[PDB]
Design a protein around this ligand. Structure first.
Ligand code: HEM
Lengths: 560, 666
């Protein structure tokens, strides 16, 4: 009825029923069988032909392909990660010359069909045009699955600065991109000659002192310009593809780059099933409460952005500076103790293991979270075993760009009941956005919140969400107590965001936050809460929470 | 949506937003519950007044009856949507409409019953069951009840008690019109108004301006509720839900003929209610002030709305109303039948009703089909029936058109129509303009009838074939022949079991709304439409419960197959006709052809090639796939080079789904 309401439609965007290929189709296995030589030949023969319905300017569609490649990959926003070359449905201001020219590539996708997506095709056509000009490129990596539903003065210098900084491009990369896309040295020579007749953009490279320094350096040294343009272009097209394990094809370079957030490759033999049991029995008698383990294992695995597929638990970054310094992770609490205890466990295990079986800290954090979940569930009457797939390695400090990780800090985490100052939208909207980023669905988000409440995973262990009298137990008490109409909620006297579900002859119980009551208030979410809050829905809730938790933990596992 | 195609309406209620997950059939769960225990629990929660919403006369019966009526009171025949169905009354604009006031409470009074069962009793079943049980709790034996209303998890895209001027004669026509859109005649409307208003009262009493916002705009401190009254204590003795303060009968917690004896006992004057105004009261000395106060105190006066008084003044209503005032057993009978029709209107055929309370009697408005009285055909006979159909002289265009005409009348909004029943032969559907009788349809019917006679005469025993099966079997045989001509060897699955109804079984009047005003798959842009052709195509596809890939592949198959209306060349982008290929896709995306509106402006376009010749001609439906970005992405999947067998398989799957849409008995 009332507009500006909570939009649950965002959670289930791009379902599996609108996908023509169905659920029996993985793009990786298809594009791994493609022949990039024939693809390059087809792209070139399209490049050197003049379609009658689109006059081929100078008989060479190269620069048009370059423009579409640079325009599909120019909509990447670091603060959110949406958009981008492949991680954003750029299809479905502009002059409409960016999709009518997308029809020029139809004779190429006609041959391949499902073995080559449009997102891969546009970027690869741009790259092949760039290589066909005469320039040589760093490399290319396929694997961009296409979605099926739309989701002169120095003033120009600072405007370009902000516009390119929103794309995670420093000054050298911005200068390289600007000098390249508009190009030999046919640019810097004419630009630095006769001042371009002293009469907008692309001239500020000679005005801004930091830009002018780099440009005048490149004036007599085209080698730096070539290397910097190759690196900047490769960063530009592959910005939102995630870990290096998602790159496919034989054109992917062997080198590893810092902006990809690299993690070391596995060097030892992973843990089997007896060693996993030994670890889960060792860090269940190590003096660590279920709350600490669950909160730590969620802190590492809730820094994942499903748009550009960066973050996650892989790499063991929770032990390193950008992740441990965040307010939400609470360095002033029990994160250092948990990290030190896990390091001690890892050192003890690696020094006494059969053969060359070794466990990594990144793996051990998630294994500890799984062990804590199992212990809590067993302390609730059930007997389960949460699945756990090893194969994580811990990155060192030198491989983590501190500035690049500042955009992953959560301004508001609904699952952990965190809320930082200066938020655009209210508490529930940020929870919805975070759940959408984690590629979660409405039932998965509901069950995950309802479990994390009773597991004591709240920020600073606040009682704002624990709707149960017995913590350290995975039960559906949150739902069955939220739906109870025997308590009358009201805003707290302290005028804060908290509430008060006071009843029982005037007594006050279940002090609740906003992201807690939004589940019982919103009818669409109350439906799911009633599904999980029934009398016989106790084991179904546990199984669903285990499934959601395992899905969240293994979000970043793209190598498997 | 009405200014740009909204493809998200095709994938409404996805499976990823369903908490119960896949492989969960509601029929199995709800068929194994204790109905007696459910009724006992409901009757237990009816008589226990809660302190957060007090009960009038210590009984939640009338509130449950009103909630059940309003849940099933949104059904509309033309679209078919609304009604109980998926229980949209919980999460929709429906929960926040001003005429659904205080019905958000009646869905929380039933929570203690829902939690005791869980997935074994959907909300939609409960909402309409409680009221039904309420009807039995007062002393009125209802017709029956059938569980099985599956529960959805996403909202979809889809009467004045004061007349503005409350003139009973001028409000009777409004009542008749608004009940005509629910397929209720005069006698059923009068029975529903009289019976439903025997139980209960009207709550509105106060300034009527001190009511809070709707639940969709209420603060989270109210926890999903709305209309929080601030006048007085707010709820119970001074609740405000509608504004009018009338108590109809002397015993609003029992069934009796006291509504008629009150309506036809006093003359009525007009007065202003404490909340709002414009209600009728007794005339001579305020009548007799003998009406129970819901929570105790002074007796009220006999009062009626303007809606209720219309039944006395309208000459059509007055005669039957007086007859019921004389004989009450007829009133009870018509009320039972009308209520049963009301709560089960949009539940589909009788094969979907579950539980022990479902009656054994058949009713005309259900469009009954005769029970199977023979052994169905196996696999040896089907392989011979297909050969006989193929060698009967019927071209694939006629067979496909007949099968689609039989099976495209279905609408998933209320699950009526479908290829079952075999009603393409019968009067309401054989004469529709879209099911072109000025052509080769009667010939197809005659050929299928003679094939049926030949097969049944030489029966191998107790195995016989029905015409309803024969239409779909001919469609599948034609598609098999087309695919074999195109080069692929496939076998379209066929599941026999359909039966042929008679002309007395079908109702001609109630099928005037199933007529397709615009069928996107066979162009037929019929006169009198509220939207362009493409939006009507999306509406038709959403009615068939089709997705976007299925709709695209079905359109692209029906074009080249020859299913078009009047066999127009308006959309057949293939050169070799009567063949199942993706030539509608590989030629729609052909960029060497320029599309311009035809000189004879009628909504059709001309596709000229580069040599200045009119190569293809298409319509808005045919050309919307090559222009809309979301749809063009699907066309490029079936329009590729290697995706010929994938296209054929997808088309066969879509055909199977459409044929077996209205098959709930299997
Ligand atoms: C044109 C047709 C009708 C009109 C204009 C009408 C009018 C109304 C109105 C305005 C209310 C609100 C009273 C309140 O909220 O306290 C109401 C309540 C109610 N209606 Fe109707 N009604 C109609 C038909 C029906 C039907 C078809 C049924 C049942 C099948 C029914 C049964 C009830 C009941 C049981 C209540 C509530 C009684 C209570 O809460 O004590 N009415 N009606």
């Amino acid at each position: 009825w009332w507009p500006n309401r909570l939009n649950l439609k965002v959670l289930h965007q791009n379902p599996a029923v609108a996908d023509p290929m169905g659920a029996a189709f993985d793009y990786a296995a298809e594009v791994a069988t493609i022949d990039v030589d024939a693809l390059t030949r087809d792209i070139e023969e399209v490049m050197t032909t003049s379609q009658p319905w689109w006059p081929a300017d100078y008989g060479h569609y190269g620069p048009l392909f370059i423009r579409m490649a640079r325009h599909a990959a120019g909509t990447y926003r670091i603060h959110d990660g949406r958009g981008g070359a492949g991680g954003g449905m750029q299809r479905f201001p502009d002059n409409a010359s960016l999709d009518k020219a997308r029809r020029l590539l139809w004779p190429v996708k006609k041959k391949y069909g499902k073995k080559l997506s449009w997102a891969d095709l546009i970027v690869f056509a741009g790259n092949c045009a760039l290589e066909s000009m005469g320039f040589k490129t760093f490399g290319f990596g396929f694997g961009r699955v296409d979605q099926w539903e739309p989701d002169d003065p120095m003033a120009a210098a600072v405007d370009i600065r902000e516009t390119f900084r929103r794309m995670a491009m420093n000054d050298v990369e911005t200068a390289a991109l600007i000098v390249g896309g508009h190009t030999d040295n046919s640019f810097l020579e004419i630009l630095y000659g006769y001042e371009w007749e002293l009469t907008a953009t692309d001239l500020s490279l000679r005005v801004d002192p930091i830009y002018e320094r780099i440009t005048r350096r490149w004036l007599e040294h085209p080698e730096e310009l070539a290397d910097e343009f190759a690196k900047a272009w490769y960063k530009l097209i592959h910005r939102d593809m995630g870990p290096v394990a998602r790159y496919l094809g034989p054109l992917v370079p062997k080198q590893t780059l810092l902006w990809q957030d690299p993690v070391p490759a596995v060097s030892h033999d992973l843990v089997g099933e007896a060693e996993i049991a030994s670890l889960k029995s060792q860090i269940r008698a190590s003096g660590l409460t279920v709350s600490q383990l669950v909160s730590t294992a969620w802190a590492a695995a809730s820094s994942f952005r499903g748009s550009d597929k960066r973050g996650g638990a892989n790499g063991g970054r929770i032990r390193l500076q950008p992740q441990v310094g965040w307010e939400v992770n609470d360095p002033d609490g029990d994160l250092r103790k948990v990290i030190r205890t896990l390091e001690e466990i890892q050192e003890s295990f690696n020094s006494a293991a059969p053969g060359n079986i070794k466990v990594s800290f990144a793996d051990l954090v998630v294994l500890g979270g799984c062990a804590a979940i199992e212990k809590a569930a067993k302390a609730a009457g059930h007997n389960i075993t949460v699945p756990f797939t090893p194969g994580r390695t811990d990155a060192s400090q030198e491989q983590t760009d501190v500035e690049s990780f500042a955009v992953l800090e959560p301004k508001a985490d609904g699952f952990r009941n965190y809320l930082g100052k200066g938020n655009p939208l209210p508490a529930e909207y940020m929870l919805l956005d975070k759940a959408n980023l984690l590629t979660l669905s409405a039932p998965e988000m509901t069950v995950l919140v309802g479990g994390l409440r009773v597991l004591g995973a709240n920020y600073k262990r606040l009682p704002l969400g624990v709707f149960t009298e017995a913590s350290e137990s995975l039960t559906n008490d949150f739902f069955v107590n939220l739906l109870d109409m025997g308590i009358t909620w009201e805003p707290s006297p302290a005028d804060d965001g908290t509430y008060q579900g006071k009843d029982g002859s005037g007594k006050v119980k279940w002090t609740g936050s906003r992201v807690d009551l939004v589940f019982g208030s919103n009818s669409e979410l109350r439906a799911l809460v009633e599904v999980y809050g029934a009398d016989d829905a106790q084991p179904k809730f546990v199984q669903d929470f285990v499934a959601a938790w395992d899905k969240v933990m293994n979000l970043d596992r793209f190598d498997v």
